[model samples]
Target chain A: AEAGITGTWYNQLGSTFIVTAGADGALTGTYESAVGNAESRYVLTGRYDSAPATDGSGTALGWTVAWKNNYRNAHSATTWSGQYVGGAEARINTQWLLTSGTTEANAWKSTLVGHDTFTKV
Target chain B: AEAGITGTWYNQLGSTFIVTAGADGALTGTYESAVGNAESRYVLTGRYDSAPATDGSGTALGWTVAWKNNYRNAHSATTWSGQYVGGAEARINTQWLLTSGTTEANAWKSTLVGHDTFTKVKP
Candidate 1:
């Protein structure tokens, strides 16, 4: 069922994702960030594959969150891709990349990468 | 000295970074990726703080690597930020974000987030 990943998850970064999954493996949710507008809620959408991770660890998952909770006209889109390790301590190990909306004078600083392990609490 | 992170490092993702640091905490290096032109080495530049991590765990480090090893016209840049945990076994824990060169119809996919733990193998 979708219950494997259909719940509220939090990461050590202090961000929260409330997700609901369909039988078809489609996932949608609201993401609240401790870094962004703490009060603003962002939209997140992604999917899980029928097959397991390439390494046969768990279900492969990828999701994107469009940020609109920041400065005036401030916007960016970030995608997180990784595998869900479902077991006694279900967790999502994901790597994310973020691209800025406007032109980045220093492209190196504008584009970013990071990783996180999220747990459902 | 600067020997803590001054050397060649590799991650589980099949990428290698040859780094050198100065006494002032400045760092420069060459990075090669398995995904990009394996033969092509991109330029890397970043800085480390003498002070410990924000969480007081280890030394703070942040670096960026420009990707010129991909498609002929394909280009991008990535930055890794985190702390360097040193001990008998040394390692760097970092998070990175990559931005593309061309316009991305779907910014979500074009912009990327990833991470790695780099271990030094060469001095």
Candidate 2:
């Protein structure tokens, strides 16, 4: 059931996400992206809820993920939602926000924004 | 010429490598793999030299990358070699060894080993 999205993915900007699904369909992984024109890289932890079965076969499932990263002096919250495109691929839309706290709840309330498209690795 | 291999790749085991090629065709990247049962992950650095162009068009080039990881008390080294398959994809073969130092020079001398195949992220 989790085969479709349990893999690695990358975006054109050289960022990457690697996801692994637990037995219960709970997803866990890491997202790493280098800062633009900087020496630092942001490493975030991601969590996703179990996706509903797709086409009655559990393939091509759609789900959303929340990410949090705590840097030396700041914290970030990010949202990712996408659908498995089958064949070990997925197309994910990601948004970043400057958050006051390191929680998904806070990320939704932040005003600042950024976006990117993540393709399956 | 460098377009073929500069990207992200993953293996069936859930390990991943993200590569960026320099102007001279030198490659740099990170390899992260979770241990079979432990909660720890091995993060390694990789370096590769420019490959000779394929078919004289600077496409389908082949090259090798060397990796090194330093754990809490032990060190590991790895080797990978593969070719670009076009369409922003690559097929790489990898091998691992237990080495005294975290260097490619020592990796080639160690005998303990492991292997895997890596496929490109972009279709």
Per-model TM-score, in order, reads 0.48, 0.35
lDDT of 2 by residue, B1-123 (tens): 355567777887887667765554334455566434332333322222233322322121112212222333222223332233344344654332222221223323433434566788852
RMSD to the hidden true structure, all candidates: 14.2, 19.5
In order, the B-chain TM-scores come to 0.82, 0.57
lDDT of 1 by residue, B1-123 (tens): 368888888987768889898888899988886456556678889999855544537788899977764443347788899878877678989988677765543443455665679887888
Model 2 ranges off by over 4 Å: A1-121, B35-51, B56-73, B95-110
i-RMSD per candidate, Å: 5.5, 20.0
Q: Each model's fnat?
A: 0.30, 0.00
Residue B44 error, candidate 1, Å: 0.3
Tens digits of lDDT, candidate 2, A1-121: 3455577778888876667755432344555666542323333222222433223221211122122223332222233322233444345443332222212233234334344556765
A16-59 per-residue lDDT for model 1 (tens digits): 98998777878899988766565568889999975544543678
Q: Which window of 10 residues has the lowest lDDT sum in candidate 1 chain B?
A: B102-111
How would the docking of model 1 be graded? incorrect
